[PDB]
Amino acid sequence: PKIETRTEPMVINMGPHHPSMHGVLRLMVTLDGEDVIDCEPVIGYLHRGMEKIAENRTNIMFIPYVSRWDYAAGMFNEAVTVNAPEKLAGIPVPKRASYIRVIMLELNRIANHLLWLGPFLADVGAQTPFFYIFREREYIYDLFEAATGMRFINNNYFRIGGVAADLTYGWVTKCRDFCDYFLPKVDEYERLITNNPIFVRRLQGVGKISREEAINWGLSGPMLRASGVKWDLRKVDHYECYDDFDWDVPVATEGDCLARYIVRIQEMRESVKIIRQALDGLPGGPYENLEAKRMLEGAKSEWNGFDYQYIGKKLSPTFKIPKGEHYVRVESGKGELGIYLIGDDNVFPWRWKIRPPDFNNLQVLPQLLKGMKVADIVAILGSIDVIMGSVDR
């Protein structure tokens, strides 16, 4: 062995394995003791070349790829890639279909917020939110397997006209039971942090992200709300009738890990309130009342029309898109998702520019890891809620 201890700064090379919950990222940490001076991130072990996939591909052949873009929720990319051609060609959408769309989007946002505080609390302390959070997510897994057929992203469920399938018979009742049971589980998770030992004092002043630096660096998502900027993209642009229920954006004063935790903790309750008001909506009730009013009443008298249908119009498999470019923005669980699509009157599009939400937020990680300890590196890496499939893509 040749270990010559000298008076030079030690370069720590964190490998791209990360065998706790993280993907592939080569971190080169340069320090001179019990601090952190420099940090170099190296990516490129998960890039699959998605932009070359959409060079010769139609809309019906791009759904599993665009669902395998991000492996946390997936349906946000499907929702924007069924919104881009329907706005390029000008195809309307029914109200009940958009209600089902926003219900499934908020139900995936619930699971996406649930898969952040697992490793973030595991890498800082006791390893017993793990099994209960995984049980609470396996409940959502069984609910989605009963509803559509799968537990996550491998699920098409979306076309240009609307949703090809419908909800089952007991899905609304089990969803009401899940809204009954999910609220004390998040009150317990807030009571775990509202009166605590030094866990509150440990991650209290490690980030310290100011407002103007977050605006200049281009932060979007829960970090922009933790900095104190009300830029929720669902309030700027009404996506699918977002101006009908009550809304409340949780805004924190300072930007730290505890504030970014409690913003998502409150946002769980806000999403529960939104899906409760969506169950309070649904103009026509569940599928049983709709089937009874269809089979009991006349053929086209009052119920069967344009607004309350499965799709509304069966689209062609090989259809032509109009020539032009388009850009839409949707607030996702990580940040803002956008698609810059260019068509030139053909089946296969010309340019498919993808706007990733985590690749723009990863630029704060060289600024965040500066002058901190060794044990705060994994907590800082887990607090931003980044995904290697989103920054490599």
Binding site: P1, G125, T128
Partner: protein, 365 residues
Amino acid sequence: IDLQGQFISALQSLGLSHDLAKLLWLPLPMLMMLIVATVGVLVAVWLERKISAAVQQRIGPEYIGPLGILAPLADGLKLIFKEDVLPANSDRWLFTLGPAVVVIPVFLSYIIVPFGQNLLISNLAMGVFLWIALSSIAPIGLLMAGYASNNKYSLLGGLRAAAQSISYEIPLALAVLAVAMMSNGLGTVEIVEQQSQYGILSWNVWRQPIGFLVFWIAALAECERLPFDLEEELVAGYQTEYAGMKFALFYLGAYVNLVLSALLVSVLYFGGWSFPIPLETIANLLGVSETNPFLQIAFAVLGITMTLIKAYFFVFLAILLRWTVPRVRIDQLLDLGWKFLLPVGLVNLLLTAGLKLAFPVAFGG
């Protein structure tokens, strides 16, 4: 009764020279205590696995035997069959004998713990010295294995684990000193006799309540239950370099240290081989108990049972408090140790000396 005296008389009736006959009598209990120690280790591994399963609402290892009790035996039989791998360095004998230097004295310290008046090995004067000075050797083997590890991160983790281990030796000695002052002796036999004189009212847990908590915190820091030093600055502290054999040796050594600490804490504070009702009243109520062994054998079995339920209770409490209290950093652990266990231990020794010099009636005199 006396099995050793009867064996000596039988070997004298057979015809021998009284020296080689008495020479070979000791290795049979000297191997019996070792094999029941491995039995207790195979008990404790299955117990820790099934209790960690029952805490997190699941079932432990199954489909290996009746309920998976052969799984520690299967692990110990499989890990000695694996290929011993070596890194690209020198000093292969040092890398081999490092874990041997770790494993020798913790296994050697089995001559101290008792199980009764006669069911023990050595009680000469100073068994607490033979525990402390032999348990304070394993940092040398840890630093030797870290130097023979040939790594930048594993050596730093071994240095951090050695600095964590050597700091909790001084309150571990002061809490022993606070009981040895009151017991006016260093052997465990007089310590357990001063507790087994009376029943509950002569226990050292009610006489020294702060020292028991200090000794328990020092034992949980020494046997690496709450300090996670096995995410340790890249992946692990003193791991990711050995094979299945050296990892199995480290695992059994850690479980031997846990079993020995869980026995020694109860022996020094609560007291194995003890009953809430004194044995003299039961012996006077039953009949004549001075030569009849039919009740004495049952009393020895009851003392072994009391020691075993105390050891099982302390093991279950330690492995229940492992996943109960959250993980704290090693710097905060060293800070809380050096700022709590030493000053309250010193003032506890001072108030112990003051209470012994004030009223020497209920203390050791």
